[PDB]
Amino acid sequence: KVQEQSVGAPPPGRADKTAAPQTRLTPYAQAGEDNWRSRISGRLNRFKRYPKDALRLKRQGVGQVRFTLDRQGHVLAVTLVSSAGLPSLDREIQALVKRASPLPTPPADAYVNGTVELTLPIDFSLRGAGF
Numbered sequence: 001k002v003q004e005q006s007v008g009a010p011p012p013g014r015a016d017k018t019a020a021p022q023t024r025l026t027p028y029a030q031a032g033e034d035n036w037r038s039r040i041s042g043r044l045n046r047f048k049r050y051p052k053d054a055l056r057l058k059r060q061g062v063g064q065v066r067f068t069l070d071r072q073g074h075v076l077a078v079t080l081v082s083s084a085g086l087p088s089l090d091r092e093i094q095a096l097v098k099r100a101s102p103l104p105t106p107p108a109d110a111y112v113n114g115t116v117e118l119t120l121p122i123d124f125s126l127r128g129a130g131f
Contacts, residue, residue, distance in 0.1 A: 004006045029116050031107035037120065043102030050096055056125030061086040061093040065101075066119035074103030082118050087130040097122050 002010060014024065030036070041049065064082035067075060078098055086093065104105070104114065110116050 009069035026110075029107060029110035031091060031110035032105040033047060034105055035106050039104035040102050040120075041106050044097070044100050044121045046073075047096070047100030047102070051061075052125065055093065056127070059089050059092045059124060060073055060126040060129040061089040061092075061124040062121065062126045064119055064121045065094075066117060067101040068117040069101060069103035070115070071103065071106045073104060073110075075099065076115060077117060082121070085130060086126075089124070089126075093122070093124055119123045 016024070018024075039052045050059075061079065063086055066079050066081045069078035072077055075098075078101055081118065083090070107116050
């Protein structure tokens with residue numbers, strides 16, 4: 001509105017097709033300019049971190065794993081988003097990740113609405129296993 005702003009100062013807010021309501025303050029619910037997957041990997045170490053070198057020679061698997069995470073990194077919900085074909089692979093690799101869905105950087109300002117459910121591709125160096 002411009003009826004209140006009779007101070008010679010309009011509210012600096014871009015009314016955009018995309019950024020109409022609140023979709024101009026929300027950085028995809030990341031809430032942190034940090035490489036979170038490496039941090040998550042540390043949390044996974046808390047849940048026993050299987051070294052990726054062992055996986056690329058054993059349990060390979062590239063897939064997209066989306067989940068809702070508790071502040072201290074407690075798996076709340078997990079949904080398989082995309083799978084590149086991990087049959088015998090999925091059981092072990094997800095036992096590791098599916099059960100150890102962690103959250104190192106606390107996105108308070110990301111889940112004020114419910115919780116943080118976001119898609120993260122879990123990569124194990126996949127040559128072509130599960131055949």
